[PDB]
Structures are given as C-alpha cells and as structure tokens.
Write a protein that binds this ligand. Structure first.
Ligand SMILES: O[n+]1ccccc1S
Ligand SMILES: [Zn+2]
Length: 257
C-alpha cells in the first residue's frame, strides 16, 4: 500500500490513484513573483475559541489531532472562501533533516515541516460528502522553521511517545490550535488537492506567508515516531511529504503586497 519509501512513495501513487497526474494536484511551488495580489480577497477569519480536540492518532503516515466537528465550534471563513468550513483535524508533514519536510515550497525554498489544518464545507453536511466536491475542503497550511520553540506545540510533542506506532491513539482533549498560528494571517491561495492518497481535487488551499518557529528538540521528537505497527521492524516516520506538482492552468493569488 502507499507510503513514502523507495517502493511505494509519491512517484508510485499514480498507479493506484490516477488523479495523482491530474489538473489540480498539490502541493505546488509558490513563486512569489508570479502570484498576483488580489485586493478583493478578504481577511481570513479563524474562529478557534470553541475548538474541542478529542484524540491524537498515528495513522501510519502522520499523526492527526482530531476535533469534534458535530457542531460549528472551530471554523474557517472569509479569505477566498464562501461559506463556513469546520475544523476536523490537523497534521504535519516533516523531513529527516531541517532542510526539507514542507510540501509547498516558496521560491523553491523547503521548510522543515508544514502544518495542515483541515476543514470541510458545512454546506455538504459531512467530511465524506465534502471531499467529493470541488469546494469541499479548505486546508490552512503553515510552514515550520527550526529556531525558537513553539510553546503551543509542546503538548503535541509530549504525547508522541504514547502513539509511537501505526494505529495507536491517545486522548487529546483541551488542545488549543490558536497556539500554532503565526502573528500574521497574510496568505497565498489556489485550488488543489489533498497531498496524500486519494489525492482528491477538493481543496481550497490557504498557505500562510509567515512561518512558525519550532525548536530543534520539538522536530526531533516528530522524527522518533514510526510508520510501522508495534512489533514490526522500526521505520522512522520522516520525509512524509509529497514534492511540488505541476501548477498547470492555475494562478496563485496573494492576499497582500
Ligand atoms: O495530507 N492530508 C491528509 C488528509 C487530508 C488533507 C491532507 S493535506
Ligand atoms: Zn497534509
């Protein structure tokens, strides 16, 4: 099955998921000189004060911090979006080394990691329905660079020991995702896809320009997770990122000059 090794990595995925060579795949390189400022873009509205985290799960490809999305509690709206999108989960993609790990790139620059806050359009009733629609998901992407620690990330880093291997979960209540946001909500936006199989073309991407800083110790702890199940040969969970895909007939818009 798919993953991130020599044999089942991104260059293989098209054989089970032909959409991998489609017209609106993600990630992409953000060429900052080609992106057009769009003064009609609104400020993003991130309303996370009522967010209800529940659980953290190692799914064999990353870890997902899951939220209660049975009511409008943590929502994204505004920006390029019409309507209201509910937070369902966040996860990260990261590298074996600080010089790689992000999925989007900025003028070909790779960051150490990238956070994806996944939200689904409430007009479609459920996440499973929303992923079948071209405007079903909105993913807020935030880059991570290694420098100062991110205090709001430390509760995530400290639970990782308890979900080392694939299929492990742990209770993860009362986590406030506002502590993962940078100061500025200036963003780039474009239409694309999920970056793991099934690679559905249902995502409005909103990528924040300002990274967050995490410490070397914080990202080292991500790198101690395992892709394998318990009792299986250890394969460290690193380099769980898809590289940049062709932009094709798309334009990346900037909310700022
Ligand atoms: O990687 N990924 C997994 C699930 C949903 C979105 C994304 S970006
Ligand atoms: Zn992702």
């Amino acid at each position: 099955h798919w993953g991130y090794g020599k044999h089942n990595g991104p260059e293989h995925w098209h054989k089970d998921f032909p959409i991998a060579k489609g017209e609106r795949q993600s990630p992409v390189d953000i060429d900052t000189h080609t992106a057009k400022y769009d003064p009609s873009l609104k400020p993003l509205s991130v309303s996370y004060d009522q967010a209800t985290s529940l659980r953290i799960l190692n799914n064999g490809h990353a870890f997902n911090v899951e939220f209660d999305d049975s009511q409008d509690k943590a929502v994204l709206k505004g920006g390029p979006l019409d309507g209201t999108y509910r937070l369902i989960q966040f996860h990260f993609h990261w590298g074996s080394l600080d010089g790689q790990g992000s999925e989007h790139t900025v003028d070909k620059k790779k960051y150490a990691a990238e956070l994806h806050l996944v939200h689904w359009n409430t007009k479609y009733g459920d996440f499973g329905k929303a992923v079948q629609q071209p405007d079903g998901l909105a993913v807020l992407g935030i880059f991570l660079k290694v420098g100062s620690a991110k205090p709001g990330l430390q509760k995530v880093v400290d639970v990782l020991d308890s979900i080392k291997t694939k299929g492990k979960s742990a209770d993860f209540t009362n986590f406030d995702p506002r502590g993962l946001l940078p100061e500025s909500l200036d963003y780039w936006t474009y239409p694309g896809s999920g970056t793991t199989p099934p690679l559905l073309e249902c995502v409005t991407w909103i990528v924040l320009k300002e990274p967050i800083s995490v410490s070397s110790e914080q990202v080292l702890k991500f790198r101690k997770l395992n892709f394998n199940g318990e009792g299986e040969p250890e394969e460290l969970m690193v380099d769980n990122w898809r590289p940049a895909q062709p932009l094709k007939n798309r334009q990346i818009k900037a909310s700022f000059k």
